[PDB]
Amino acid sequence: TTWHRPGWTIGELEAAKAGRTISVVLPALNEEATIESVIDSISPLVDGLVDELIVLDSGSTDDTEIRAIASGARVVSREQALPEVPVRPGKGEALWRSLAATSGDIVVFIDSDLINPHPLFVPWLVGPLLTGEGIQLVKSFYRRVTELVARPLLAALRPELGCVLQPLSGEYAASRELLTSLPFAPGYGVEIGLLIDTFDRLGLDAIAQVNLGVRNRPLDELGAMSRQVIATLLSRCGIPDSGVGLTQFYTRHTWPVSLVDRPPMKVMRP
Amino acid sequence: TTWHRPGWTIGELEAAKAGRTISVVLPALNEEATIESVIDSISPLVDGLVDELIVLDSGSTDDTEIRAIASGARVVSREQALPEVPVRPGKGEALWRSLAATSGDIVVFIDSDLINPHPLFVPWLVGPLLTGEGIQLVKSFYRRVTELVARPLLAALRPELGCVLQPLSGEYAASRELLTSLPFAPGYGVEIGLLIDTFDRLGLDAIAQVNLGVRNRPLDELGAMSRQVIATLLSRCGIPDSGVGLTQFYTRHTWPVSLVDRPPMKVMRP
Ligand SMILES: O=c1ccn([C@@H]2O[C@H](COP(=O)(O)OP(=O)(O)O)[C@@H](O)[C@H]2O)c(=O)[nH]1
Ligand SMILES: O=c1ccn([C@@H]2O[C@H](COP(=O)(O)OP(=O)(O)O)[C@@H](O)[C@H]2O)c(=O)[nH]1
Ligand SMILES: [Mg+2]
Ligand SMILES: [Mg+2]
């Protein structure tokens, strides 16, 4: 179901959580310009509704770590998250590793690139989870790879999902149980994979969708992001993807594409 | 092979044509603003290199027909092209019907929306056909659904084709033999279908690619165009496409998608 209008209060939400804990992950790669306002918008909730918040630094070479530390956030490196396993590039890798660095019964994911996030994003996302039943994933929407790639593709291969307005949204929450059960697609495939894998396994009903209000990058990427979105999506649907990277044109350049998911994190914690 | 630099002259090209005729099709739906300059850029060639040029009017309700008639072009309606078969919406329908209205051994397709086309487009497209051998299709490139949908998708499902810079280009030429052999995908699928169907059947070598120099619409469409591009492409690759139209969001709207190709025009002319 879909909440076009969120309206729980931090106090009632905190109430309804009934012993379950809530972690918050901000994945960040070189986001020094926005990282502070993102953290700051959520800071106050910590020790109340939110029990834990960390920044997953995916190898920033700018001032992201220091700015975030200055805003009172725990910063975890991909290496710190899971020391025993060498590190892979891409967003999916970081979201995956973040599971090992957190312990909330509920994990909320919020991108670090957001321009002045609303302080009610977390409580709005965590809404259906705390007050509903059998909701395990809640995606957000607001206001493109999403409108030209992901959404047409779902109409074609998983139309039951063509009602998701933002399949690729970086802002969503889920139970720890579901996320540890699932593989994690590499790079920019992670979001579309979790959507399909959750649907395929729990049905359209474990999935909520909430309005977050209102809302970038070069066509150089995007092409690349689109490619991986296609590979993850094709794979979840039983279509063999070639493995070949998108080539951009003179002169030539081939962006990397990965057909390798991470296993469910359950596996790694025996 | 790829001509990064075209350099035949109307006189030598005309020479090399050795009895083969050349038709030119401008499909047009409501293009009153550009139709004249497109025709005008090609007019002079008629009775020389080009033997026949027509405008395929796909039901314009503006002044396209009259402007084009005023520029000395034959205008054919979809109905006139093939009276005996009721008319379907979409670009593919019009390109298909145009085969019945022409008789050149070589058909050249040029979009009617082009801003001040170069007068050497036709001769550059028809180049490899007239002076090469075993080239049956030549696509153009210059300077997106193309960069986010069509091109990533070909990397994934027909990577041998990921070297085409403009899979979706509206400017291309082909032998009458090849085009009558092929089915024609509906609407905005027509281009991607002909590319795949030609490759699958004649190999990467019957296909040329020429530089045409240098170079629009709302994300409302595009979404829709992307969808049909996905359905035609999925179908050529043996993937069952759901048949479900892309739904846009409040409030709702579902754009049409077609899984129905036209049969090879050979069939219709017994
Ligand atoms: O290797 C990584 C690790 C993390 N992130 C982070 O994950 C989020 C999504 O990145 P992006 O904004 O580029 O995705 P988009 O919204 O552009 O599709 C951001 O907060 C990133 O810094 C990333 O893009 N790549
Ligand atoms: O039902 C039809 C019949 C013809 N055309 C024509 O075919 C070409 C391609 O249309 P468009 O420029 O919209 O394609 P785009 O380059 O935007 O992907 C144009 O000259 C159109 O007027 C069309 O789009 N739809
Ligand atoms: Mg982002
Ligand atoms: Mg056009």
Author numbering:
A (entry chain A), B (entry chain A): 24 to 166, 185 to 256, 260 to 293, 303 to 323
Original paper wording:
To investigate the structure and specificity of this novel glycosyltransferase family we have solved the crystal structure of M. tuberculosis GpgS, both unliganded and in complex with Mg2+, UDP and 3-phosphoglycerate. The structure of M. tuberculosis GpgS comprises a single globular domain with an overall conical shape, displaying an eight-stranded, predominantly parallel β/α/β sandwich. The structure can be subdivided into two closely associated subdomains, the N-terminal nucleotide binding subdomain (residues 45–137), composed of a four stranded β-sheet (β4, β3, β2, β5) flanked on either side by two α-helices and resembling the Rossmann-like fold, and the C-terminal subdomain (residues 138–281), consisting of a mixture of α/β secondary structure, usually highly variable in GTs with the GT-A fold, and shown to be involved in acceptor substrate recognition.
The only significant structural changes occur in the loop connecting strand β8 and helix α9, where large movements of Asn260 and Arg256 are observed. The flexibility of this loop impaired modeling of the Ala257-His258-Arg259 segment in the ternary complex. Consequently, the loop containing residues Ala257-His258-Arg259, as well as residues that are found to interact with the bound nucleotide and probably with the metal ion (see below), might have more than one conformation in the crystals of the ternary complex, thus explaining its apparent disorder upon ligand binding. Although with fractional occupancy in our crystal structure, the electron density clearly indicates that the UDP molecule binds in a hydrophobic cleft located in the Rossmann-like N-terminal subdomain of GpgS. In the ternary complex of GpgS the electron density around this region is un-interpretable, probably because in some molecules the His side chain might be facing the coordinated metal and in other it might shift its position by 180°, as observed in the structures of MgS with and without bound nucleotide.
